[PDB]
Amino acid sequence: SQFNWFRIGALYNTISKNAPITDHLMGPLSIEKKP
Amino acid sequence: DSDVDLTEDLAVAKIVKENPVARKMVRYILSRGESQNSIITRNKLQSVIHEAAREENIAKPSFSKMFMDINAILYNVYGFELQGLPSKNNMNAMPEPLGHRAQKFILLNNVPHSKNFDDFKILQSAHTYEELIVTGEYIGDDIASGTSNTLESKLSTDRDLVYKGVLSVILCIVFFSKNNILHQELIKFLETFGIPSDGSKIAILNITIEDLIKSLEKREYIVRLEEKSDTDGEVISYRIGRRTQAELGLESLEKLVQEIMGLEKEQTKSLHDDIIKSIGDSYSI
Amino acid sequence: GTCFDADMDFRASLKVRKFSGNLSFIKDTKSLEIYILTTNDEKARNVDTLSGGEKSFSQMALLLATWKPMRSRIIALDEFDVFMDQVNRKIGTTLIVKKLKDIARTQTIIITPQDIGKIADIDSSGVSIHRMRDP
Amino acid sequence: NNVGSAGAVRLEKPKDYAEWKIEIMVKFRDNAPLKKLDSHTQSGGERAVSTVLYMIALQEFTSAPFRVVDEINQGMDSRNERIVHKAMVENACAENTSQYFLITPKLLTGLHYHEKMRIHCVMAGSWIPNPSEDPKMIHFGETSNYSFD
Amino acid sequence: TMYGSKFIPFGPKCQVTEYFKDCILDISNETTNDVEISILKGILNLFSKIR
Amino acid sequence: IEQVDDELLSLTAQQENEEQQQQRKRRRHQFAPMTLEESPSGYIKKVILRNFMCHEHFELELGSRLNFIVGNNGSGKSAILTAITIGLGAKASETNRGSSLKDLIREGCYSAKIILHLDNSKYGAYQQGIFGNEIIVERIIKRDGPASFSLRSENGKEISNKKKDIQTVVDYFSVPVSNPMCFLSQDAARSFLTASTSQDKYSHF
Amino acid sequence: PVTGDATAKYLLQYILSARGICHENALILALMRLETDASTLNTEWSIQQWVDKLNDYINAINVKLNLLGYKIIRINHGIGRNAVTLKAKQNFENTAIRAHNNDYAVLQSIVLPESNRFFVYVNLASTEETKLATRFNQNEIEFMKWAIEQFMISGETIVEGPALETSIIVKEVNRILVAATGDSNLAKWRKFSTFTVGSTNLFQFQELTATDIEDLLLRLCELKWFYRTQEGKFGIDLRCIAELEEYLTSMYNLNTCQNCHKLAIQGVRCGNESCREENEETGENSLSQIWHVDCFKHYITHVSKNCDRCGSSLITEGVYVI
């Protein structure tokens, strides 16, 4: 725990890899019972 | 060309209104390929399409038309696009991507990167990291401060960034080691960073190194080629998966490595050739 | 014996809404679980996996099925109109009337501010409404 | 690990040396508590898988060229047998491993066939000519023989 | 022995079963009793419920 | 530990007293053959409240099986339940209606009267020969002096003035006045009907 | 799709990458850095039109999401004015360049000293047939439901003493009070609200052990769903209430602020004792009459300073909600 493990992680997944990132909220938590 | 954008948006709205199943399929893809950041299989696509069609009592559309509609909706709303993947046996034994006849797909962004927005993101991440683990500490129940990253930061889950950094380090090790790296020497090289190799869980991630490598292999980040012998014993060789090949291109890898060693922009020449030499037989292109 | 009487009375109470349910008393979890099967589904979901009206009706039926095992000559109760909203409240009052007007061993005094005479279910004999003239 | 269960062969060592005993930790069934292997309390298939895996573990250390197992692939619930076949596939993935002569008295639907292993069939058909008279029928359940080299 | 015959039948509206239960609940204390009292209470309740 | 032995002996003596009390009880039902549909005796025919809480001397003829008092809230709606619980005999803390029995008395008056008319004409009556067809239960609450009673009959002949006769009559009629669920107040009903956790339902039941 | 579409996609991706909720000043800075490379340099501009050029793009993304099945809600945080705007020396953009909050200003000098509303990416679908899980199993869902129930139950406090825990909210409340009028005698009332408070009760889960509970709670805190105060008490953040707008109103009987419809989690809530009616069970303003911090500031500095709930003196008001 001495080196920047976030700055490299910030360069990745943002500058390169063009990877979509989504929160994906806990929607199935509130599932309607459809009575 | 504002009118062109407006009529394209109107056409996308008409398409999504005409095919209700397309919206549900797009939502399911955005859920699966992003929540678990895994590779979508072709076989499950037909099953989910048939199930949605039966639920909506709508005649099943053509798979190519559905794929085109999904790609158009993703590009018009989220800017994403689905690219096909080749078969792993081709490498063991300019190519236009399959798109419609590929057995696997993954969500990929298709917008050129800027020069300051990424700098802003990385600077914010560095600013938050200076206080995240200051004096060898951690946030949560360990300390009395919960909202350490102000109201909201770019750190996401405080572990996804570490996961991506470790993945980038592993890819750099595999890419630059003549596309052939052994497991023991890879562990020894990773020990230089500070990751223990005695089985203790790594910090932040709280996941053992072997389990992390297994997860990376499962997520198509690396390929465990097994050229096991006798004189020496079992042999674990790490390769580059098709997902990594699709995510990281030649120009993308050059841009990523430009800031790795902090080389000046004037000396950008004579580096792409070295990157190509280091990659070797890794890309099917 | 008490749990058997409560279970049977709860089963007989749920039939008013065309439901079918049961009570389960667990000592491992020290809890009472209500299972209700309505018209739509085919599996007895947990009572918490329902709506507000169904849960309120189940609670009222549980109240009656808890009064039942203890044979009481006289039972008295205050208002319940604030715990149930509109149609469910009418159904709950209907359940109270239907389940309590039949039994002769138990005399029930229900004090409510809501006018029962507005409810169409007043024509049933054995129900006495004493509306106070003085407000 | 393939079973999704945790178990270790522990050697409990009391003060008396002869009282040292062997403990096997079982997790394949959540209901079954951690106890010594026994037929009556546990199911037949899970017990068979556990003892087969214990046999497999004591193979690389041993200098025997190969191990022989009989009446093993006969169905154990079609689930425990499936997972033990998966374990056998994983073991066969490693090279320089012992050859096992497998016996399958009862056919199992959707059996997994690894590329390293090869299936052999001995059944005969009415329309198939006699093995002695047919030069290519003498080999049973073999495909590499037909191909050159 | 009695219950189920023509004289003392199962059912909720019989007077004899109500009198029996009325006496059983009279003696029953549930704190320091003979178990037969509680057994009778349960059995009489069951026979009263049987139509 | 001698305290454990003392506790054991005390519990044993308590069990002895309880079994003697059980042995003392006899049968109280005579099984008058008679004739089902008709209600048994013991129900409250009428309650009259003279100078009690808010309203003045008030008559109310409760029905035999189901009663729906539509006294509006804020007009002594809960007065009837409090009066019934007090007259039938119950602990003040269990009722939780008023700070003290003194406050139940109407302001400006030193005494309040609660009179109940339990029915004895129908079957199951408690000493129908002595009490007749009705049993009258009147309780007087005075600011000065103890609260008075009489278990008078229809003719006005005060059969008793004690409280043990109250308990005997009530237990014969099987009216659980001691159980705070048979007479549900507003707060108790709210607590029971809003129970959500299965543990809360189990506890309340 | 040359310039405007790329900027809209970048803004949406930045919103999504921040786990849905993101600070508005960060969005403004991102839009500045996207527009400076879009059309010339845009040096001669004003924030009064920058906010509109952000809002119109946000609405353009929102309508597309709505026709797709999503929505971005500009839900205002419970804490507002400068208390939430300060953050850590405003926006982040020393021997080395590692800690420079006031440096790297956009263009010559651009700063937003006021910011209260947060943009949250939410899903309007209720049944959600398409999605069944994200990264968790049913045990974690049950633990989350139990934590939500405990947080809802802890809202009501019996008496509370003059502990006067002063970390964030009560300082802003006192500043608003002294701005309205200078009393400094009994503004700090001895009534406290624990709407988002739990330390040991969450640890009493049965199915999951203490280590699993701690790991799940830490993961949720890192995901910005449950936040911790200075004392160390867990509670729901703005993200949870922004997403579950219907879960906290249908299953649980809750009231809205002075606005048409909004979820109140913190602010001022006295209610005295005579609540609106009696409600299902809980009272003390459990049916209506709740305010935010910014809403309280707006109400107290305008006409009808006294509470409209049948009359309420300011002396008994000032109840702190934590």
**Distance from C-alpha of D76 to C-alpha of D86, rounded to nearest angstrom:** 13
- Are B256 and A18 within 8 A, CB to CB? no
Closest among F72, G280, F182, F58 to C116, alpha carbons compared: F72
CB-nearest partner of B256 from A3, A6, A15: A15
Helix crossing, E15-27 with E35-49: angle to 10°?
Answer: 150
DSSP letter for each residue of G47-87: HHHHHHHHHHHHHHHHHHHHHHT-EEE-PBPSS-HHHHHHB
Supply the Cα-derived Rg of chain E in whole angstroms.
11
Number of Cβ atoms within 10 Å of the Cβ of F21: 12
3-state secondary structure chain D: CCCCCCCCEEEECCCCHHHCEEEECCCCCCCCCCCCCCCCCCCHHHHHHHHHHHHHHCCCCCCCCCCCCCCCCCCCCCCHHHHHHHHHHHHHHCCCCCCCCCCCCCCCCCCCCCCCCCCCCCCCCCCCCCCCCCCCCCCCCCCCCCCCC
Handedness of CA B255, B257, B258, B259 (dihedral sign): positive
B255 touches chain G (CB under 8 A): no
- G110-124 in b/e burial notation, b at 16+ Cβ within 10 A? eeeeebbebbbbbbe
Structure tokens at F52: 């009690």
3-state secondary structure chain C: CHHHHHHHHHHHHHHHHCCEEEEEEECCCCEEEEEEECCCCCCCEECCCCCHHHHHHHHHHHHHHHHCCCCCCEEEECCCHHHCCCHHHHHHHHHHHHHHHCCCCCEEEEECCCCHHHCCCCCCCCEEEECCCCC
**Distance from C-alpha of F168 to C-alpha of F152, rounded to nearest angstrom:** 15
- Are E45 and C8 within 8 A, CB to CB? no
A31 touches chain C (CB under 8 A): no
Supply the Cα-derived Rg of chain B in whole angstroms.
22
Q: Is F78 annotated as a binding residue?
A: yes
**Distance from C-alpha of D112 to C-alpha of B37, rounded to nearest angstrom:** 28
Closest among G158, G104, G117, G168 to G284, alpha carbons compared: G158
Q: Which chains touch F (3 or more CB pairs under 8 A)?
A: C, E, G
CB-nearest partner of G222 from B9, B16, B159: B159
Helix crossing, B183-191 with B209-218: angle to 10°?
Answer: 120
* SS3 of residue B82 by DSSP: strand
Are G2 and B112 a contacting pair, CB within 8 Å?
no
Q: Which chains touch D (3 or more CB pairs under 8 A)?
A: B
**Distance from C-alpha of D127 to C-alpha of D130, rounded to nearest angstrom:** 9
Amino acid at residue number B74? L
Q: Where on the phi/psi map is residue G301: left (φ > 0), alpha (ψ -120 to 50), or beta?
A: alpha
Structure tokens at F195: 């129970």
Helices (H) and strands (E) in chain A, counts: 1, 0
Amino acid at residue number F185? S
**Distance from C-alpha of C36 to C-alpha of C45, rounded to nearest angstrom:** 6
Burial class (CB in 10 A: 0-12, 13-18, 19+), F194: middle
Number of Cβ atoms within 10 Å of the Cβ of G108: 6
**Distance from C-alpha of D78 to C-alpha of F71, rounded to nearest angstrom:** 71
- Are G280 and C82 within 8 A, CB to CB? yes
In Å, how far is A32's CA from the nearest CA of chain C? 9
Structure tokens at F57: 């001397």
Structure tokens at G153: 């139950």
Amino acid at residue number B145? S
Selected residue of G126, G135, G142, G249 to mutate for chain A interface (largest A Cβ count, 10 A)? G126
Structure tokens at G21: 């909720």
Are B121 and B259 a contacting pair, CB within 8 Å?
no
Residues in D closer than 8 angstroms to B228, CB to CB, are: 94-96
Q: Is F121 annotated as a binding residue?
A: no
The secondary element (H helix, E strand) that includes residue B239 is strand B237-240
Number of Cβ atoms within 10 Å of the Cβ of D65: 7
CB-nearest partner of F29 from E19, E29, E33: E19
Burial class (CB in 10 A: 0-12, 13-18, 19+), B187: middle
Closest among G143, G105, G129, G148 to G241, alpha carbons compared: G148
Say which residue the tokens 């560095």 belong to. B126
* SS3 of residue G273 by DSSP: coil
Number of Cβ atoms within 10 Å of the Cβ of C85: 12
**Distance from C-alpha of D73 to C-alpha of D90, rounded to nearest angstrom:** 16
**Distance from C-alpha of G152 to C-alpha of F12, rounded to nearest angstrom:** 48
Q: Is F201 annotated as a binding residue?
A: no
A29 touches chain G (CB under 8 A): yes
Closest among B216, B225, B220 to B242, alpha carbons compared: B220
Q: Is F122 annotated as a binding residue?
A: no
**Distance from C-alpha of C84 to C-alpha of C53, rounded to nearest angstrom:** 7
Which residues make Cβ contacts (< 8 Å) with residue B59, sequence separation at least 6? B53
Amino acid at residue number B279? I
- Are C130 and F37 within 8 A, CB to CB? no
Say which residue the tokens 């020393």 belong to. G94
**Selected residues 124-153 of chain B with any CB under 8 Å from a CB in chain G:** 124, 126-127, 130, 139-141, 144-147, 150-153
- Are G280 and C83 within 8 A, CB to CB? yes
Structure tokens at C101: 């007007």
**Distance from C-alpha of D133 to C-alpha of D124, rounded to nearest angstrom:** 14
Q: Is F77 annotated as a binding residue?
A: yes
**Distance from C-alpha of E25 to C-alpha of F30, rounded to nearest angstrom:** 14
**Distance from C-alpha of F125 to C-alpha of F132, rounded to nearest angstrom:** 9
Q: In what order do the strands lie in the sheet with C20-26?
A: C20-26, C31-37, C45-46
Supply the Cα-derived Rg of chain G in whole angstroms.
22
Closest among G202, G61, G70, G50 to G125, alpha carbons compared: G70
Structure tokens at G129: 């047939």
Provide φ and ψ at C22, rounded to 5°: -160, 160
Closest among E46, C69, C9, C95 to F176, alpha carbons compared: C69
- Are B120 and G4 within 8 A, CB to CB? no
**Selected residues 31-50 of chain C with any CB under 8 Å from a CB in chain F:** 31-34, 48
**Distance from C-alpha of F104 to C-alpha of E8, rounded to nearest angstrom:** 51
Smallest CA–CA distance from F35 into chain E, residue: E15
Structure tokens at F197: 């956790």
- The Cα diameter of chain B in Å comes to 70
In Å, how far is C12's CA from the nearest CA of chain G? 26
In Å, how far is B168's CA from the nearest CA of chain D? 28
Closest among B282, B57, B60 to B174, alpha carbons compared: B282
Structure tokens at B216: 């990376």
In Å, how far is B221's CA from the nearest CA of chain G? 19
Structure tokens at F42: 């013991």
Experimental method: cryo-EM
Q: Which chains touch E (3 or more CB pairs under 8 A)?
A: C, F
Q: Breaks in chain B at C–N > 2.5 Å: after which residues?
A: 93
**Selected residues 228-257 of chain B with any CB under 8 Å from a CB in chain D:** 228-230, 233-234
DSSP letter for each residue of F59-80: EE---SSEEEE-PPTTSSTTHH
Selected residue of A13, A23, A33 to mutate for chain G interface (largest G Cβ count, 10 A)? A23
Which residues make Cβ contacts (< 8 Å) with residue G45, sequence separation at least 6? none
Say which residue the tokens 């009690």 belong to. F52
Are G143 and G208 a contacting pair, CB within 8 Å?
yes
Smallest CA–CA distance from F190 into chain G, residue: G281
Handedness of CA F199, C79, F112, F179 (dihedral sign): negative
Number of Cβ atoms within 10 Å of the Cβ of G285: 21
In Å, how far is C131's CA from the nearest CA of chain E? 34
Which residues make Cβ contacts (< 8 Å) with residue C87, sequence separation at least 6? C53
Are G294 and G165 a contacting pair, CB within 8 Å?
no
Are D37 and D26 a contacting pair, CB within 8 Å?
yes
Q: Is F72 annotated as a binding residue?
A: yes
Q: Do chains C and A touch (3 or more CB pairs under 8 A)?
A: yes
- Identify the DSSP state of F132: T
C83 touches chain G (CB under 8 A): yes
Helix crossing, B20-35 with B63-77: angle to 10°?
Answer: 70
| Residue ranges of chain G whose CB lies within 8 Å of a chain C CB | 250, 277-280
Structure tokens at D41: 């309390």
**Which residues does residue B152 pair with via DSSP β-bridges, in sequence order?**
none
| Residue ranges of chain C whose CB lies within 8 Å of a chain E CB | 1, 4-5, 8, 71
Closest among B122, B86, B82, B81 to B103, alpha carbons compared: B86
**Distance from C-alpha of G115 to C-alpha of G82, rounded to nearest angstrom:** 8
Closest among G19, G102, G76 to G262, alpha carbons compared: G76
In Å, how far is C99's CA from the nearest CA of chain A? 25
Smallest CA–CA distance from E42 into chain C, residue: C1
Q: In what order do the strands lie in the sheet with B104-109?
A: B40-41, B104-109, B80-84
Q: Strands B237-240 and F58-60: what pairing?
A: unpaired
- Identify the DSSP state of F152: B
Q: Is F108 annotated as a binding residue?
A: no
Structure tokens at B62: 């053509």
- Are D96 and B230 within 8 A, CB to CB? yes
Are C44 and C107 a contacting pair, CB within 8 Å?
no
A33 touches chain C (CB under 8 A): yes
Amino acid at residue number A6? F
Q: Breaks in chain C at C–N > 2.5 Å: after which residues?
A: none
Q: Do chains G and B touch (3 or more CB pairs under 8 A)?
A: yes
Handedness of CA E5, E7, E8, E9 (dihedral sign): positive
Structure tokens at D74: 């006969």
Residues in C closer than 8 angstroms to G277, CB to CB, are: 82
In Å, how far is B257's CA from the nearest CA of chain A? 10
Burial class (CB in 10 A: 0-12, 13-18, 19+), A5: buried
Q: Is F74 annotated as a binding residue?
A: yes
Residues in G closer than 8 angstroms to B154, CB to CB, are: 17-18
Which residues make Cβ contacts (< 8 Å) with residue D60, sequence separation at least 6? none
**Distance from C-alpha of D46 to C-alpha of D52, rounded to nearest angstrom:** 10
Closest among F95, C105, A10 to B124, alpha carbons compared: A10
